[PDB]
Amino acid sequence: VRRLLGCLGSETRRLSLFLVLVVLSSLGEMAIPFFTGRLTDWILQDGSADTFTRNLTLMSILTIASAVLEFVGDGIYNNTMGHVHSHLQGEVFGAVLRQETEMSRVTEDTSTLSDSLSENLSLFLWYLVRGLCLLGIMLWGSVSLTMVTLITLPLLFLLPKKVGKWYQLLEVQVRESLAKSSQVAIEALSAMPTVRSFANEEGEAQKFREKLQEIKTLNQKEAVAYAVNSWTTSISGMLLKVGILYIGGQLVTSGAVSSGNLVTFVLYQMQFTQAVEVLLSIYPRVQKAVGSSEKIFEYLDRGLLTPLHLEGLVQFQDVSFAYPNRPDVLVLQGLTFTLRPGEVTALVGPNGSGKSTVAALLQNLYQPTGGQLLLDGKPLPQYEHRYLHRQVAAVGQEPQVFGRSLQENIAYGLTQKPTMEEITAAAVKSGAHSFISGLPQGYDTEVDEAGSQLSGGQRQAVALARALIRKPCVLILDDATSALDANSQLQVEQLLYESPERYSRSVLLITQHLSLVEQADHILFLEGGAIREGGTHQQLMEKKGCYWAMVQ
Amino acid sequence: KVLMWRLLKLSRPDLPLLVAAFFFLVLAVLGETLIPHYSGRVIDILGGDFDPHAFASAIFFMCLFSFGSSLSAGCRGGCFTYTMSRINLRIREQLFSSLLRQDLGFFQETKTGELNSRLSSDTTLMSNWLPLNANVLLRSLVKVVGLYGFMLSISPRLTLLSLLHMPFTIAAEKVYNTRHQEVLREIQDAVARAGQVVREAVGGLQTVRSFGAEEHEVCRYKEALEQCRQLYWRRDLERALYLLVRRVLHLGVQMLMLSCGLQQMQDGELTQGSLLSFMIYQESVGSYVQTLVYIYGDMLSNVGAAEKVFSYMDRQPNLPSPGTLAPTTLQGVVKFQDVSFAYPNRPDRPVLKGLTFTLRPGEVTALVGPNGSGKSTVAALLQNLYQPTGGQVLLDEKPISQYEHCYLHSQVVSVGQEPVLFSGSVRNNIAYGLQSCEDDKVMAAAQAAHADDFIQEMEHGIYTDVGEKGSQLAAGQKQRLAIARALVRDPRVLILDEATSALDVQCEQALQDWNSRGDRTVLVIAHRLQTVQRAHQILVLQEGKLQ
């Protein structure tokens, strides 16, 4: 039923020993009052008969063991708690990433639910054993007072909860109404120019006061219930302290128990009061943590080829594409495009008409919405994920680089990091080294996180440099022409065409770049989800195609 | 600092509670410090005799005094939590009022998120100083002084041992209170870095999934998390060790404590009843003496928060002195001479440069030219929101600053391209700002703005509610509402900005044909040439200069 205990299987032996250390410490602490009754009785009924030395010695040793065995006790707990706590975080993070591209809050709650449960659970274990073992020795002193103590205990359990229900309702109501009152003020402040324009600066003050008077009358009921909540706890604690003493007095005067036995119960009962109160206080907190943490378990329990470079062959057969939002969000269909090594191509079409999905589909990041497709004559999932990812790479629709130096930011995912100078050399080839050399340490200077070190002018060249670092046999791009200066990007496409990679590799970029428009060896375009155009811009215009119609 | 004095002075209007509550505090402390004294007295009387006359009397008074303490504790606590409320319900009223007197440039720099945290959350800390923090300190301090009096009453030879040991605990407490906070921030910095790793991954995941690069992301997190685990383990290990030294130091008293007491017990000047009162005194003093030094940290936090609020309380606005003139009638003539302005947050870039132009009640003036939408400053300058850095603007040949603030905006109104609306009924938004308006007057204004033609579809007509910031209504409907908001005020100088967004020429001509535009000055600002069909004069704005 409950799933919160599923992770305890990896360290069962550690916790079992921890329980043994807790019970050992719990018994040792009880010696402090138990002897206190015994020495007091010994001296009132007998002289300085040297019996106190042996009795007192046991008091020191037992409590020393409790403190020492406590420290060795919890120190094992948290050290082992952190080790499993660490594993839990990585797996939960390791699970969320394993999803589509269609969020950090999921790691935030487990970041605060774990510590809330892990600390409170230790407190409950300590005090429950201490509470249990306190009853074990307290029952060995007098069977009459113990029965008295157990009878009055539920009143402390019950009455504060009944009264506390009245408070916890009112405090929430005040707090939520206060948020509403403060929220109205922000609505005026956020639209301040309009307020000053219409001279309602006094009206907003009046409207704010009106919402505060409604809270003032509510507070006058909040304070009244505070006395009864305080009066309930204080009287209940009192009414047991007097009760045990009086029932003790009749018992001891009857001769059944000695005066000292009553003394131990006085100290024992006082310790019990805080033990039950502390144990009950943390119960709502641990209850909230375990109940809320069940939501995390939804996320937790949610090929032969190893290419170093792609073979260049690609094909399609009635392929279809759709948006991740819903199956009815199909944006492409009837795709039959094919590719071969050495082919240079360009793509264009309506925004959102499956162009982005096709690029993602070509990278095997998402399964086709229909039809069939293959790469190098083989299915896309027919290769190892890391190797298939290294088979072909593409520049994303939003060119950016990670928060790392240009000498190492391009080595992501690669099994062999290239040389830092070679990384700088790749930046020179892509032209990013022109701005990269202006860094505080050139290529060695770390770039800002999420590509914040430079604008789109250098970001587009950075994406090309990252692709140039891999230098795959199959390349692709989507909307890369709108990220930086057109002339630099057009020359970059021309540089790729003039490079010897024009025979050792192939590429197809979905962008309206003029250089790729005129230098394309082939092209294919879609309209309304189906293929409806292709070829070079000049060739299509000569053939009176869509390019010629665009001249209107 | 002296800042505590102003915070203290603020609570003086609530004396009929503080004085009474402080009386109950004394009656609660005295009622509590005496029950241990009678507790030992009962067990001492119980030994060596069977005297109900002494036993019953001892129990009765012990029951009475603790009962009085318990009743006073509820009353003492009850009064202060009410005083905390009335402090919180007074600062928020005053703080909000002070903010509304600030200049517009102040709100351009300050973000609403900062102010909301400053107002809604931080003002709670401004109510926990006197009602809560002053108490725990005073309640504990008077108890510790009183308890040692009863300590001295029992056996002077036996108190001195507590006085020697106790400073050792506060020395350990002082070290631990600072040491664990220092390490806690060391955890926090590592934790913040771990969150940053998550933030980077989630914002650019499409780059990551282009490769099997998810391995480097978990390696990023697993090693940052590894630092957290090591830093975590370092902290609670010290907490556990600090617990041990304090726990064994408890034996440093009680082991020694009984040795002197039992030796004294046989020798004299002590009885078992007298001892038990001391025994339950000792472990209570250590708890309160630790709390007393503990609460001082919260003293600085709440007072430290006071510099946040009172900074906005005392910020002197830079607006000119409020105007006083209010003529019976206005001809609505506006003239400009060499006016120039720059934003306070973006100075030394004059958006407008030495402008000069004049408007008349019987004509219509149109403003054209992109200017990077810098022509909007004329709309803001005319309503006396900002101030002309150079030159001055004269309305009816008078300095606009001399006109009373309430009266001025009852004659000159504007409608920006962004129809800002407030939560509440439509009937409330149309007549916004006015002290009172008849529903009959709104109907004519609603019809004049052609807004009544669609609002009647809504429930209850004009009294239909509107979502916050106009979330419930459409933009085309929102523009009409703002138009009615201006037409209902019977203005003499109208300012319409980018009316071509949803209002056609015929819709705009209706506004231009009203009593506020039929013989009153109206300024229209747009980018298209459609304004040339009816504007009397044309001003083109290029690079902050009119040609």
Binding site: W126 | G77, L132, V136, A240, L243, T291
Partner: peptide, 8 residues
């Protein structure tokens, strides 16, 4: 681990 004030 024992307990480590909010009372007014």
């Amino acid at each position: 681990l024992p307990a480590v004030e909010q009372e007014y």
